[PDB]
């Protein structure tokens, strides 16, 4: 319907424990939008029905005129908090569609096909916590024997990734083992594993 308001998303990946923003633009031919919708696909032209209900949105200056030009689009807030208890596999995504009204009333349309992925149309994945986080090189820790680590050269190899992941959650729990493997455990639960190699070396060989 190019009479309707276009739509313009993209992919919007979320992650347990973790807040997320992103921003859809929306223009029109007649340069003004007076209602957005961010729904499921079911329940006829009246619905408003979105979930999970943590999925949350805000359109500021609606029905204004020139609020969506090709210049200076309208912009949907779409965000929220994912709950740590949110299952997680190759299907733990959702797609949703978006919807706007001109003064006329004409309505974007909702299209079924993935080819309109990242406009009217998105999907909102939702990914464990340690998918947002790629751990960083830290410096390396000399032991004394690669295949013994003591308990203070366990607490040093910690400290060293932490001090070179300042992004990392905060709470999250950060644990070596005796042959220096790094473990992250992120507030879900989810971890993330460092190779012994990448983090420890010794002066055993000459
Ligand atoms: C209830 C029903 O029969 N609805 C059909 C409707 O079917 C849905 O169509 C969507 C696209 O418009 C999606 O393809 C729906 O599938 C998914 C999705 O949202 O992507 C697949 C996911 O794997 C799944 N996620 C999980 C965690 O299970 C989700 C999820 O179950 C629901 O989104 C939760 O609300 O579903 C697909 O189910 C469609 O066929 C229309 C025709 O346009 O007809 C009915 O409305
Ligand atoms: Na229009
Ligand atoms: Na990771």
Redesign the pocket.
Known sequence: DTEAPQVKSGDYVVYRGESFEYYAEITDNSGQVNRVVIR????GANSTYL??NWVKYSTENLGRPGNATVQNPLRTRIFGEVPLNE?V?????????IVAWDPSGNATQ???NANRNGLE?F?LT?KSQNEKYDPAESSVTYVNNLSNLSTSEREAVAAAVRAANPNIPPTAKITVSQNGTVTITYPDKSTDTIPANRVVKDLQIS
Request: net charge neutral.
């Open positions: 499921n696909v079911e329940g979930s999970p299952i596999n190759e299907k733990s995504y959702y797609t949703r569609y909702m299209v079924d149309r999907v939702v």
